[model samples]
Target chain A: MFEARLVQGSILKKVLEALKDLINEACWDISSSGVNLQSMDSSHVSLVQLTLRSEGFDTYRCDRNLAMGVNLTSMSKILKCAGNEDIITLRAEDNADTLALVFEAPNQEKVSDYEMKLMDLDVEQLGIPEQEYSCVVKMPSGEFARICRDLSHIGDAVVISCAKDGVKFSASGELGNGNIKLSQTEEAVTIEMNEPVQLTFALRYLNFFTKATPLSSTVTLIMSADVPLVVEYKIADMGHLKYYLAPKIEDEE
Target chain B: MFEARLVQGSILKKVLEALKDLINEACWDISSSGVNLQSMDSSHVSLVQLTLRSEGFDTYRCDRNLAMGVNLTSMSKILKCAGNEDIITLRAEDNADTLALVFEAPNQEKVSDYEMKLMDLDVEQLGIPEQEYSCVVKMPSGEFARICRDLSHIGDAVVISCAKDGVKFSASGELGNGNIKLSQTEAVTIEMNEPVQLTFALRYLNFFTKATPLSSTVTLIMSADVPLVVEYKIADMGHLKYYLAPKI
Candidate 1:
């Protein structure tokens, strides 16, 4: 039997919401350490990875390691039944074909359980190489989400130009061009730059990644000359969710 | 021959929102008592009745009784133009074909008036017989709405069973069955003469629940073989009631 209980169950719900729009189905790898998911989005244009430490759960028991393939949309629907203040638990027997989600009201009087069928999914996990980025900027997640949303209205692509003092995001289309700059602040925004790097990314995928804004107050962006842009949101001290989208190569705008 | 002015104008807006969906057109009966509306839904599957007592209005007048047939959707759109804090007044001359809705801003600078063409609708006012129900359940409107919404996912029809202790709402579909039970509490009160179990379409129930925002508590009166009365108190003025025939 494998069971995990989270007193702060809404975090798990938020995690599913942050992923379901981009990914319809994925495999959640469970181990003694925690639960982790890494999969390319349905379009295969962007990559998303989630990490939840075992210590994050109030109680976690994993008899064996397993990869449970799940339809994320169904999982999200089931999670929607859980109240925000309810305690949530995940339970499955050995070699189980279904995953059971249990929610308990704070008063402990109301309890709801929903079961979703799991699938047999054959997937190859891609190994992401570790490397240092040329420019890493940390800013308020809400600000980033708003900027990406506003830029999408102007153009399909956004250019991120980083410097020593601050960073700028620019977009231009037939309608008009718009630029937003955020300077490094004492706490709200901070920048760590080894060398200035400017990259153009698809606003569509960036906006998808910004759905993680609710998970964290701040978001970190790592960009380099030829590498994919990394957008990361910390899920408290338990873990973090990261999305990687390749920059536009052709200048056929 | 009628005019009614409500200082808390947002109540009128809420009342319109509560009606516009189920009813595209309705006839408002204005009298010395106040404004009243009794009309079946566009599909004729349900009935809605509204009673706004004249005493509840800041200013009320009546020279003759008039039935003003109005396109509810258009009236709702016009009411949307009025600010929540604005004072709203309704006026119509004797034998007039148009009804005038006037709005005044709180600061007294902005004044707007809209004229809606009224139709001569031949409608028979439905008289709901006064009778005691076998079971009457009162619960928070928000809670009732949520339950209806959640159960809709499970089935198209909801079976409500009322007992002396509490009430139960249950629904089932191909996927599974869901049952929600609310016990009698300080807020939720259940009164029953004889236990009653009735099934109703969730669609109409959901539509009727759109009025949830206008009232705090909702009362459900159910019997064996009759239309269910879903009543909501519209502020301190009067009541808004919806009657839906139970499914065969």
Candidate 2:
């Protein structure tokens, strides 16, 4: 048995909608601690990890550990009935074939309940090891998304060149090239790095990953010479979501 | 030459969007006093009349009386550039082939201007006779729209019966029948006339009168044999728009 309730439906809606596109279907491992999901994209180019802690929910319980396979398309569709201010409750019985969602208005003005059909998906959960990344760049999520969106119009890939002074994002395609540079600032954004790292990745994937902008206030980019790039977004008072994308080789393009 | 400016582009956009579906192409007459337009639906079952008075515009001027044909579909596309709070300016020279719309952001954040090609339409201006309707019901426009929309779900035609005490709108369809009644009260709306009853096409009223849904107040005039006339006045004599046609 697993059940949870959040005061605001918006966080769940935003979180699910943010990651659904990247990973179509995932199995959520529910326990007393929280609900956790980690999966790689179909192309095997990137991995997405999400954690919804029990502390974040108004009511949380799990008498039995459960691995619930959820079809995100169907999941996101049912979430539409819940309003931002509405209290959302999620429930499922042990070995159940369906999940129940209830939305209750704050002032007892409205009540909506939905039951979604669940499937049994045999998903493999990959264990990612911690790495000492060469550089870590943190900036406002909106600015990060804005840079990726604006530069995607000019190029197919974006190159991240990081140093102690600042971090620069440059792209070159039909319209020659363009670069945006930002550094530590009291009013704007900041960057921290022990060593310089320059790498190129597909702009399309970066653009897709930035869809989580509405779910978080800031995005931290972890980069190295040849390893995958980690884009992490910290959920306020909750947990964090980390996205890992492989770097493009010199001859890959 | 003519140049007109409205404080909020949303008003013009909202009005145009609400009426565009009823009429495909219309010719607007520009005068020193204001802009006037009237056109009937393709089926001739309904008509639309609008007037944007000079006083409503931030800046309004016209050197000569001009009638310019406009494609409602294209006009709607250009209006999309104007934000809700942005100032919208319309300009065209005497007998010009194109119309220009300029959008100025409130905080000077952005300014976008678009020019759309115009056409020549041979549309005749209509003249309507005045009459003192037997019953003139003045109530909240939103309430009027709500009743029409709610009844439209039940059937295509809605019967409106107005008594000295109140007015009731009822409809019947395959699903069943439903009725909504509104009574006069100091806290809400007011009713006029001894009593009047009329049946109208619900779909037409829902589509055409939705433009006035946000208006402060709406006036519905009904006579024994004439069409029902719905008038909506914006601001204080800023603009007067009336949907002319009676549902007998």
Candidate 3:
């Protein structure tokens, strides 16, 4: 009996695109207020949280709150059939037993539906600490994506260091070291580091975080030593997509 | 010495994009009139010819006609460094030894150069006859891309038939048959004739051809029975990108 529609397919598209590089299944909490998804990837090095408010949808109708275990990969496949600006509508059939996705344009129409099979997905809250980060950088998402791509070619792990002077990203392997640094007073974007901090992270996780960058012009990064790094990109005025990647402890071997 | 500059990186991007799909490495004819590239893929099923007038450049200087050989992949990597709308300048060193690619953006500058290495690529002129195809259907590029993707899953060969009454497309394999048909008078476009045409291929080419669908909306299909089928989409007002899959 729950139904909703959106004017644009961007949010679903962006969310699915981001999830494609991460975990497959998640516990989706749907309520009259909105929809929320929280899951940890199989590697356990990254966590993804997605939320869509009732206000974000053009048509929102719900009678109660429900927790549904869903497969994101299948959902993304159905969503991929939709056009960019297509009017997307989602409806639950048989009392939330099945989900139907409909995409409509002027004269073209495509609809796909999937049966909601029951699964036990633990719906748990990941309480992220609200700690002060030592370094923060705001720059164009594309620039960050490019930097990640270039640095990833050199090694499996990247060293990110932030100091009072500036923030630097360096990756070293058998090939060579690839380093890129930016200062607080730089031109395109500014970087600020109050305390010296260094952290190493896997390139694969960082590359997945960059998927949200294409939809956003700018992205903000917050990092600390020996801890998780948070990358947030604003999708709309109040809507934001954030990715948190846990640090990879270097082995002595 | 010859040199040219363009305000946007789109030209270089487009050229490299078109050339990278080609298997041969050869010199493009660069004359005082401008740069002209004409070649086909390994099978010689389709031809791509690009001509840029001297006036198309912000700065054009050339004393004599020259054929400059360039690696398509290397040029693509160099062009990728330039911003989408960034102004790009191309210059040939004295004696045509090297080519420099310069990118200019406010507070952002990048310069990359490649040594000119001449290569001998054997090319043949492909003259595709202008035939009154049995059936011609014009639809959105996205639709065509989807059809190619969906039908390709069924098998490598696709049978397209056009008659005075209607047109149809079908693909069959051990899995099943995926088919779609349209009448001649239907709102959806489907032009055809008395004889039905079929073509078969590896489906890899269709996957690559779908990349260009993002640039345009309308795509035209021309086919004849057992003959080569041509798919064309307009890139610019005067420029057309075409893909031809030979019948197997």
The best candidate by lDDT is 1
- Interface CA RMSD, all predictions: 17.2, 11.3, 7.7
lDDT-best of 2 and 3: 2
**Chain B fold agreement for model 1, TM-score:** 0.97
- TM-score of every prediction relative to native: 0.51, 0.57, 0.52
What TM-score does each prediction get for chain A alone?
0.96, 0.95, 0.88
What CA RMSD would candidate 1 show?
14.5
Candidates, ranked, DockQ: 3, 2, 1
lDDT of 3 by residue, A113-155 (tens): 4444545576667876465777888877887887678566556
- In model 1, state the lDDT of residue A37: 95
Top-TM-score structure, candidate number: 2
What candidate 1 keeps of the native contacts, as a fraction, is 0.00
Name the runs in model 2 displaced over 4 angstroms.
Answer: A1-16, A22-213, A216-253, B172-181, B186-195, B237-248
| Two-chain DockQ for each candidate model | 0.01, 0.02, 0.03
Quote the chain B TM-score of every prediction. 0.97, 0.91, 0.72
Off by over 4 Å in 1: B1-248
Candidate 3 per-residue lDDT over residues B190-236, each given as its tens digit: 65544656665635446345345324444345555223443433333
lDDT of 1 by residue, B1-248 (tens): 67889998988889899899999888999899899999999898899999999999999999989988888876776676567887999999978788887777665533555666787788677777464689999999999999999999999999999899789999999999999999988299999888988899999999999899788899999888678999999888999999988887
